[PDB]
Amino acid sequence: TKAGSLTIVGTGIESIGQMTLQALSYIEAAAKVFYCVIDPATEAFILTKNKNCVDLYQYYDNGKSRLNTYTQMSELMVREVRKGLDVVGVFYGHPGVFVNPSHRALAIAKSEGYRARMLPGVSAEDCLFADLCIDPSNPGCLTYEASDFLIRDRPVSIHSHLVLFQVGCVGIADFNFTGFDNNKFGVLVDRLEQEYGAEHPVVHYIAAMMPHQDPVTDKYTVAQLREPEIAKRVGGVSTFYIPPKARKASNLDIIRRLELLPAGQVPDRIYPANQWEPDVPEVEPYRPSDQAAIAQLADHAPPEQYQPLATSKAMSDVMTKLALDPKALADYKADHRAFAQSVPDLTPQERAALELGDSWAIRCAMKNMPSSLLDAA
Amino acid sequence: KAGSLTIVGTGIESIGQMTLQALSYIEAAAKVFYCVIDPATEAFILTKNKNCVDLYQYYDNGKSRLNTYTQMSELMVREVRKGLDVVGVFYGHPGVFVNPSHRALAIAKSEGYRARMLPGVSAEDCLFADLCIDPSNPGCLTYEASDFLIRDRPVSIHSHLVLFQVGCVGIADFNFTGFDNNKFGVLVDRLEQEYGAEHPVVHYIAAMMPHQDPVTDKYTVAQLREPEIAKRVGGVSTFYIPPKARKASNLDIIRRLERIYPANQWEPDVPEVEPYRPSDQAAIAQLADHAPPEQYQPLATSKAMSDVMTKLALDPKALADYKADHRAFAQSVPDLTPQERAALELGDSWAIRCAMKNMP
Ligand SMILES: Nc1ncnc2c1ncn2[C@@H]1O[C@H](CSCC[C@H](N)C(=O)O)[C@@H](O)[C@H]1O
Ligand SMILES: Nc1ncnc2c1ncn2[C@@H]1O[C@H](CSCC[C@H](N)C(=O)O)[C@@H](O)[C@H]1O
Numbered sequence: 140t141k142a143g144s145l146t147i148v149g150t151g152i153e154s155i156g157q158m159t160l161q162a163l164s165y166i167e168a169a170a171k172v173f174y175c176v177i178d179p180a181t182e183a184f185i186l187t188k189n190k191n192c193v194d195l196y197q198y199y200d201n202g203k204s205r206l207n208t209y210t211q212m213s214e215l216m217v218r219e220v221r222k223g224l225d226v227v228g229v230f231y232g233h234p235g236v237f238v239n240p241s242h243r244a245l246a247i248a249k250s251e252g253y254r255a256r257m258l259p260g261v262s263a264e265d266c267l268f269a270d271l272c273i274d275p276s277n278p279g280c281l282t283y284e285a286s287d288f289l290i291r292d293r294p295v296s297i298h299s300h301l302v303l304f305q306v307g308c309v310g311i312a313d314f315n316f317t318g319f320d321n322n323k324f325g326v327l328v329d330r331l332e333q334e335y336g337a338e339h340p341v342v343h344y345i346a347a348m349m350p351h352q353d354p355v356t357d358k359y360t361v362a363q364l365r366e367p368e369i370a371k372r373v374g375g376v377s378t379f380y381i382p383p384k385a386r387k388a389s390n391l392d393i394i395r396r397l398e399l400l401p402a403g404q405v406p407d408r409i410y411p412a413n414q415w416e417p418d419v420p421e422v423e424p425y426r427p428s429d430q431a432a433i434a435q436l437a438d439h440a441p442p443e444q445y446q447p448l449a450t451s452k453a454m455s456d457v458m459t460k461l462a463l464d465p466k467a468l469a470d471y472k473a474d475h476r477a478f479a480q481s482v483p484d485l486t487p488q489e490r491a492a493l494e495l496g497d498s499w500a501i502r503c504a505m506k507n508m509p510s511s512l513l514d515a516a
Numbered sequence: 517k518a519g520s521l522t523i524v525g526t527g528i529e530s531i532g533q534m535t536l537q538a539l540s541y542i543e544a545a546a547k548v549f550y551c552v553i554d555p556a557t558e559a560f561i562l563t564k565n566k567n568c569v570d571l572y573q574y575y576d577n578g579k580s581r582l583n584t585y586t587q588m589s590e591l592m593v594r595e596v597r598k599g600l601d602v603v604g605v606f607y608g609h610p611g612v613f614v615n616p617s618h619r620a621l622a623i624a625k626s627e628g629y630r631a632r633m634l635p636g637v638s639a640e641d642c643l644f645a646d647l648c649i650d651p652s653n654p655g656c657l658t659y660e661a662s663d664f665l666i667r668d669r670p671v672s673i674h675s676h677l678v679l680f681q682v683g684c685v686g687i688a689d690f691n692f693t694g695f696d697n698n699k700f701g702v703l704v705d706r707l708e709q710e711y712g713a714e715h716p717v718v719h720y721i722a723a724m725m726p727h728q729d730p731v732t733d734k735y736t737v738a739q740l741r742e743p744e745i746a747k748r749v750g751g752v753s754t755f756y757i758p759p760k761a762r763k764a765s766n767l768d769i770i771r772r773l774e775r776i777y778p779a780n781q782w783e784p785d786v787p788e789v790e791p792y793r794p795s796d797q798a799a800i801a802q803l804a805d806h807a808p809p810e811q812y813q814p815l816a817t818s819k820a821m822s823d824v825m826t827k828l829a830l831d832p833k834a835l836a837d838y839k840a841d842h843r844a845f846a847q848s849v850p851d852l853t854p855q856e857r858a859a860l861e862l863g864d865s866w867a868i869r870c871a872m873k874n875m876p
Contacts, residue, residue, distance in 0.1 A: 151535065152635075155829035159637065160539070161532030179872040180825035182815050187822070194815075197808040206776075210799040211806075235644045237652045245648065246778035247791055257648070259527075259641035261535065268611050269635040272621065276613045276660045276680065279669050284652045290770060291763045293655050294672055304652065310773035316811040326772050350829045351839055351863060390668045397666070397686035397699055409582075409615070411622035424623055432583040433590050441573040444692040448558050448570075455563070458556035462531035462726045472727055496727060505555035 143220045145248040147228045147241045149260020152346050154180045157261045160463060162229075163188065165258065168465045169227035171219050175212070175240075176231050177376075178348060185229060199314045205239075208314065213244035220253050233262040237284065237304060263378055264302055266346035270354040271380055273413060275300060278383060285379075286310050289326060295334045298387035303379040321373060328364045335384055337362045342380040342415055343372065358415060382415040449507035453484035457493065458501070487516030518599035521592060521624040523617045525610040525636020528722045530556045533637045536830060538605075539564065541634065544832045545603035547595045551588070551616075552607050553752075554724055561605060571616075575690045581615075584690070589620035596624050609638035613660065613680055639754055640678060642722035646730045647756055649780060651676060654759060661685055661703060661755075671710045674763040679703075679755040694751055704740045711760055713738040718756040718782055719749065734782065758782040817872040820851035824860065825868070 146165050151157020166172055166188050175195040176182050186192055195212045219226045228234070234241045235257050248255040264282065268275060279299035285306045287293070295301055309323040331341065338360050345355035363369055389406050400406060410422040425433075441447070461468050471478045479485075479494040491513050492504035503510045522541050527533020542548060542564050551571040552558050562568055574587045595602045604610070610617045611633050624631040640658060644651060655675035661682045663669065671677060686699040707717065714736050721731035739745055758780060777789040808814075827834050838845040846852075846860040859871040869875065 153537070153829075155826060156537030156540070157535050157635070159527065159533050159535055161529070163536070164532070179815060179817065179869055180822070180829070183817050183822040183872065184826055186815070197812050198806070200809045201811070206795075207799040207802075210796045211803060214800050214803070233641055233644065235648070235650055236641075237650065242648060242650060242778060243791070250791075257645040259533070259637050259645040261635050261637060262641065265609055265612075265635040265638065265641070268609065269633040272611075272618060272633070274611055274613065274615075274618060275658050276663070278667070279657070279659045279663065282651050282656045282658070284655075286773070287652070287654065289773065290765055291654070291674070292766045292769070293675065293763065294670065296670055298667070299669065316809075323773050326769065349863075349865060349868070350835055387667045387669075389666055393665050393668070393702070396702055397662070399686065399688075410619060424619070424626075428583075429586045432586040435583075436587060436590070439574070439587075442576045442692075444577070445573050448555055448562070450555065450559050455556070455559040459531060459560055462529075462556070468726055496725075498725065498728075501725070502555060505559065 140254075141252045143223045144225045144254040144256075145216060145220050145228065145245060146226070146256050146258065147230070147234045147245060148258045149230060149232055149234045150176055150181055150185075151261035152232055152263055152266045152348065154178045154349050155184050156350060159258070159260060162258055162260065164463055164465055165227050166229065168225070170224040172227050172229065173212070173216050173219075174229040176229065178231075180349070199316070201314070201316055203314060205312065205314055209240040209243060212240040213247065216240075216244045217247050220248050221251075233260040233265075235259075236262045236264070263304070263346060263376075266354075267302065267344055267378060267380060270346060271342065271344065271356060271415065272411075273300065273380075273415075277413075278387070285327060289330060297335065297384040299383060301379075301381040303381070306379050307374045307377045318375065321370075324370060324373065325365070328361060331361045331364075331381070335361060335381065338417075339384060340382060340415060340417055342382070344378045344380055345376055348376070380415070382413060382417075384417070446506045446508065448505060450505040451484075451486070451489065453482070453486075454489050454493075454505060457482050457485070458505075488513045491516040517628055517630075519596045519601070519624075520630040521596050521602045521604070521621060522632050522634065523604040523606070523610050523621060524634045525606055525608055526552055526557055526561075527637035528608055528639055528642050528724065530554045530725055531560050532726060535634070535636060537634055538636060540830055540832055541603050542605060544601070546600040548603050548605065549588070549592050550605040552605065556725070565603075575692075577691050578689060581688055581690055585616040585619065588616040589623065592620045593623050596629050597627075609636040609641075611635075612638045612640070639680070639722060639752075642730075643678065643720050643754060643756060646722060646732060647718065647720065647782065648778075649676060649756075649782075654763070662687075665702060665706055673711065673760045675759060677755075677757040679757070682755050683750045683753040697746065697749060700746055700749065701741070704737065707740075707757070708737050711737060711757065714784075715760060716758060716782060716784055718758070720754045720756050721752055724752070756782065758784075760784075813869075813873045813875060815872065816874040818851075818853070818856065820849070821856050821872060824849050824852070825872075 148162035148165055169189055172189045172192045173195050174185055198208050198211045216226055216228050230238050245255045281296055281299055282302045283293055285303045286309055307321050309327055340358050341361055343357045347354050408422050410424045412419045412422050475494050475496055479490050489504050492500040503513055524538035524541055548565045548568040549571050550561050571588045574584050592602055592604050606614055621631045657672055657675055658678045659669050661679045662685055683697055684695055685703050687695055716734050717737055719733045723730050775789050777791050779786050779788050842861050842863055846857045856871050859867040
């Protein structure tokens with residue numbers, strides 16, 4: 140196989156703390172690090188973890204197209220790959236969510252035969268679910284870029300969540316150092332008034348970027364967005380959450396064919412209610428059957444089929460090492476058997492299970508389950 | 517008031533996908549409650565705090581999921597009511613397709629206790645990274661599979677579609693050996709009514725151990741009816757269904773507001789684009805002459821200033837002290853310059869930039 144690789148990782152949204160353990164370990168093991176982050180504390184942190192770093196942010200400019208900048212950023216990364224080096228690229232948030240240059244660079248490295256991988260990170264939408272206290276599963280989530288939303292006339296749903304990114308950059312294909320003018324914002328507000336109506340709520344969301352700050356979670360009407368004191372608050376790191384207008388009725392034919400309710404009855408919420416919806420009929424946390432479930436806790440014992448963790452220090456140490464040390468992981472992948480034979484202090488059962496590497500084998504080893512094959516080691 | 521509840525995630529891939537902040541809160545907690553599906557991750561949590569309880573033991577065969585979730589949340593909230601700092605830990609992102617966390621946080625908040633969710637890496641985040649797609653182009657619709665069929669939720673054939681919980685269509689129960697997915701054919705019918713019979717559906721399973729590869733298998737909608745294929749769909753399975761066409765642009769909107777590489781590899785019958793077109797080659801040529809613009813501000817900080825900003829993100833106690841009294845905290849940090857102390861005291865992002873980029 141060819142020598143040289145590209146791994147792209149994220150930093151998360153909130154400064155330093157939202158970086159993953161694996162992103163940190165790949166930054167440290169890199170021969171060379173390229174980064175694009177909007178926070179000085181996060182930049183300073185990255186520089187303490189590797190001696191060979193380059194700031195990609197310097198390739199943005201006034202009156203220079205974003206597409207030119209991304210071609211340049213990706214070419215800087217892949218040139219170092221072609222010289223045989225293990226390269227790491229670092230971007231704000233999740234490095235594949237609204238990020239052009241990472242997908243470009245990974246696809247180039249892949250087509251020329253180099254190992255190429257993206258590691259996921261915490262996105263702005265992840266932070267939004269956490270701070271606004273909503274689940275994308277109830278009642279579904281539609282996610283769009285605000286200009287693409289308008290240009291391609293993409294459909295909304297009044298019964299599901301709607302999230303809109305780049306609401307502070309409506310129809311802007313350029314970069315500007317000192318911020319922008321969001322003069323085309325009014326085209327967006329008209330569209331929202333059409334689809335939802337004038338008194339419908341819209342939450343202006345800004346996740347805290349520094350660990351001491353609070354999130355902006357300010358609820359407005361769509362009509363309030365036309366007032367200028369409110370419009371100027373919207374900027375480059377702003378997101379809109381639009382709650383549902385109403386609950387959608389159940390399809391009676393499907394509820395039958397999946398056989399959940401008997402005929403003759405009706406399906407008329409679960410606690411807690413979405414706090415941001417209009418006209419929300421409040422739900423009680425301690426209903427009668429919740430209280431019976433809580434009373435059963437006194438005589439609760441684990442069911443027979445429950446299997447408690449029953450591992451060793453040596454096995455836990457090696458599985459942790461594989462997740463936190465990329466070079467150890469690389470060595471394991473090249474030859475399972477040899478790596479397994481040289482781990483200190485493992486039992487024969489543990490060696491054989493690590494040699495196989497399969498999920499059922501690691502579980503047998505770490506939960507002390509009988510395996511005919513593994514107990515004979 | 518004494519007592520708090522913080523709920524955190526572990527991510528999807530064992531250990532490595534936990535955030536730095538999630539780990540620091542696990543370590544500082546008085547009591548820890550966890551629900552994870554990987555023994556290496558469970559073992560790692562138990563080395564980081566001496567007072568942990570496994571919430572997975574409250575599931576059972578034939579026992580309602582809702583009863584289990586009421587129990588999980590009450591166990592957490594009972595410790596908060598004794599004035600303790602409590603941490604709950606869930607797989608992935610702890611508020612994405614997870615009931616008990618939302619319930620416990622809302623109960624804690626309604627009784628006057630400090631309550632917060634910290635985000636984590638979800639199964640959808642992994643999907644974007646492993647399938648090499650971006651939800652921005654051309655939009656993403658995300659549903660729970662049963663809710664998708666019961667409420668007859670709309671498909672958008674011009675956008676990404678992601679369906680969670682495809683391996684248990686119509687099932688409210690738990691079972692330790694999993695369930696047979698016998699109502700699966702009701703999902704497939706709805707997919708073929710909406711997309712073609714030859715339209716691709718990608719069966720996605722993110723790797724759970726660090727050495728494993730993801731499942732990214734492309735099938736047709738029709739070949740989901742084959743029984744050898746349908747058995748592979750289980751409790752950690754997710755479906756990605758790519759767009760069937762490109763949506764037309766709106767001529768009116770374009771007036772008022774005044775393909776590109778790489779292509780989505782899963783869309784049927786899309787010609788791949790050239791990576792190095794002449795506009796790209798001209799972009800690359802300018803790198804030989806490139807100097808940083810006059811408005812570019814390089815990092816110019818001290819060791820003392822960087823150490824304190826790192827400490828506020830990695831040490832929950834130091835953060836609490838700082839929030840309580842900005843001035844007193846700033847005065848007690850050793851080796852800061854007078855400028856660095858005043859900036860920490862204000863604490864606004866513009867102030868911190870001044871100190872750490874030595875701007876005039
Ligand atoms: N602090 C914040 N709060 C809310 N939304 C934010 C944000 N920072 C960035 N965003 C959203 O993301 C867009 C920037 S593009 C970069 C997004 C990043 N890759 C991610 O993982 O989210 C903005 O237009 C905005 O809509
Ligand atoms: N390894 C994996 N790969 C793909 N999808 C997964 C997965 N593990 C869980 N899921 C998805 O999530 C559902 C479990 S619900 C819990 C999801 C978790 N909190 C998260 O953040 O993702 C499953 O039915 C499946 O659709």
